Design a protein around this ligand. Structure first.
Ligand SMILES: OC[C@H]1O[C@@](CO)(OC[C@H]2O[C@](O)(CO)[C@@H](O)[C@@H]2O)[C@@H](O)[C@@H]1O
Ligand SMILES: OC[C@@]12OC[C@H]3O[C@@](CO)(OC[C@@H](O1)[C@@H](O)[C@@H]2O)[C@@H](O)[C@@H]3O
Length: 480
């Protein structure tokens, strides 16, 4: 990957809420030596959200005691008593290697988050795991993980949300050590499944109003919805979360944007948040990937994106996405191609593997319009991004690679007005990925794609009528 974060070696997994110290974002992420094997937390820092400097393990795997996901916060006021400005993290670990004993352990750092000391006793104990007995009780006790810490400024206390089976649990604390159980968050459509890597935060909308957001990684493939990040805007009163609407909204419609996490931007923490996710899906994450053989590592994170909350007619709010601004600093070349009308297919006179391409497509009677990236000259390999019916789809099927096929998870789709006869696309292509930001960023589709060395072409196509492709600009991306 030219511009996506990958671990120096080994298996990469869930990212953890970055903390800002030493004038940089300290990113933690699950890492193991063996694919899908036991591991812990590794450290990487970034000052712009594009380039990462890896620092190794901070919270190591220990005999039958792996470190699972959680989150880290900067205790500025020294509320926990480990010193002002100390970095405190909570993470789930299976006590005694027992799955039904998974609970929250606290780790702390007094050097900006480069070295951590473990607090021997868990701050939030899995009591269900000790009293469980029936098959249901066990299953319930075996889903008590991924704590996300947030400072409820209005109440002057800490609030933590923990993922569970089809519901979320909440705890409050004045020192990050002593927690008090609160009211759970329940939602009606369990076919949405989930509640892994929950997220809880406050953000100011474009109208100046303050809002709470509760989100989590889901699995709604069964009912035709994403397996990415779903969120509920609302409010937290100190006892429970009140969702404005129980039907969640989605942050990504692609195949690979899992365990995503968000964090305040250094420049505008109240209105602009940054977000990153693991580019994988458990439907197939447990396997070898091309990079295992070529470079001895498995997994990459998504591009970092910026998030803002925008008011919608009727008083509701939605999130908007856009690639992190600094990526502009890694552009090594900018190519513009002439507008053109296509009726059938046309190959563009450009080739590459790491770049961002923007374009506008307008049509009338065509029942299908789109663009192919990672197109091999033999014409057999390519990933298609286009508009059909009420879908803005991304079909990676033709890019399936022998030995690493992603079938049958080929055609991803985001909703788009059926009446749309024009669309703007912003597409980020790298050696093992494709990320599509549609129109104003309300919908995004992120997917890993195993491109072959020669999958460098780009073509345009339409079915049932001509289309006008304009504003074509290709920005090549390297390192700089
Ligand atoms: O089994 C989940 C289901 O049970 C409910 C009952 O209302 O809550 C159970 C759950 O609440 C806790 O006290 C807090 O996390 C747990 O100890 C207990 O298992 C529902 O809220 C939930 O849907
Ligand atoms: O659903 C859109 C899609 O399927 C329709 C159709 O169009 C063709 C030919 O252009 O493939 C291109 C894309 O159009 C495909 O990747 C999308 O899923 C044709 O092969 C396919 O039957």
């Amino acid at each position: 990957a030219v511009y996506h974060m990958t671990p120096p070696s080994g298996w990469l997994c869930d990212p953890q809420r970055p903390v800002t110290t030493h004038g940089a974002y300290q990113l933690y992420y699950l890492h193991s030596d063996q694919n899908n094997g036991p591991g812990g937390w590794d450290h990487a820092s970034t000052t712009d959200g594009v380039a990462f400097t890896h620092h190794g393990t901070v919270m190591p795997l220990r005999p039958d005691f792996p470190v699972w996901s959680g989150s880290a916060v900067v205790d500025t006021a020294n509320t926990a008593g480990f010193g002002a400005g100390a970095v405190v993290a909570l993470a789930t670990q299976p006590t005694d290697g027992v799955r039904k004993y998974q609970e929250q352990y606290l780790y702390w750092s007094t050097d900006g988050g480069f070295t951590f000391t473990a607090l021997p006793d868990p701050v939030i104990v899995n009591t269900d795991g000790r009293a469980a007995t029936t098959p249901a009780e066990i299953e319930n006790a075996e889903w008590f993980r991924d704590p996300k810490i947030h400072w409820d400024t209005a109440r002057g206390e800490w609030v933590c949300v923990i993922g569970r089976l089809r519901y979320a649990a909440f705890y409050t604390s004045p020192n990050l050590r002593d927690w008090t159980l609160r009211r759970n968050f329940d939602y009606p459509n369990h076919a949405l499944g989930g509640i892994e890597c929950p997220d809880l935060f406050e953000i100011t909308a474009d109208d100046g109003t303050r809002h709470w957001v509760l989100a989590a990684s889901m699995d709604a493939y069964g009912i035709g919805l994403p397996m990415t990040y779903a969120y509920w805007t609302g409010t937290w009163d100190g006892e429970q979360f009140h969702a404005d609407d129980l039907t969640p909204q989605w942050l990504d419609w692609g195949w690979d944007w899992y365990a995503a996490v968000t964090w305040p931007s250094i420049d505008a923490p109240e209105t602009k948040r940054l977000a990153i996710a693991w580019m994988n899906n458990w439907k197939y994450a447990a396997r070898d990937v091309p990079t295992d053989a070529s470079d001895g590592y498995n997994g990459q994170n998504s591009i970092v994106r910026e998030l803002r909350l925008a008011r919608q007619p009727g008083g509701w709010y939605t999130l908007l996405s856009t690639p992190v601004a600094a990526l502009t600093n890694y552009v090594t070349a900018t190519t513009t191609l002439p507008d053109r009308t296509v009726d059938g297919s046309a190959v563009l006179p450009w080739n590459g593997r790491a770049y961002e391409i923007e374009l506008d497509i307008a049509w009338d009677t065509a029942t299908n319009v789109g663009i192919s990236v990672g197109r091999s000259p033999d014409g057999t390999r390519h990933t298609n991004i286009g508009k059909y019916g009420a879908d803005l789809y991304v079909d990676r099927g033709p890019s399936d690679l022998a030995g690493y096929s992603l079938a049958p998870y080929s055609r991803a789709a985001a909703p788009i007005d059926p009446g749309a006869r024009s669309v703007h696309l912003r597409i980020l292509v790298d050696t093992q990925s494709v990320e599509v930001f549609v129109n104003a960023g309300h919908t995004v589709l992120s997917q890993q794609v195993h491109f072959a060395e020669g999958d460098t072409g780009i073509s345009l196509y339409t079915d049932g009528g001509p289309a006008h492709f304009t504003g074509i600009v290709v920005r090549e991306i390297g390192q700089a």
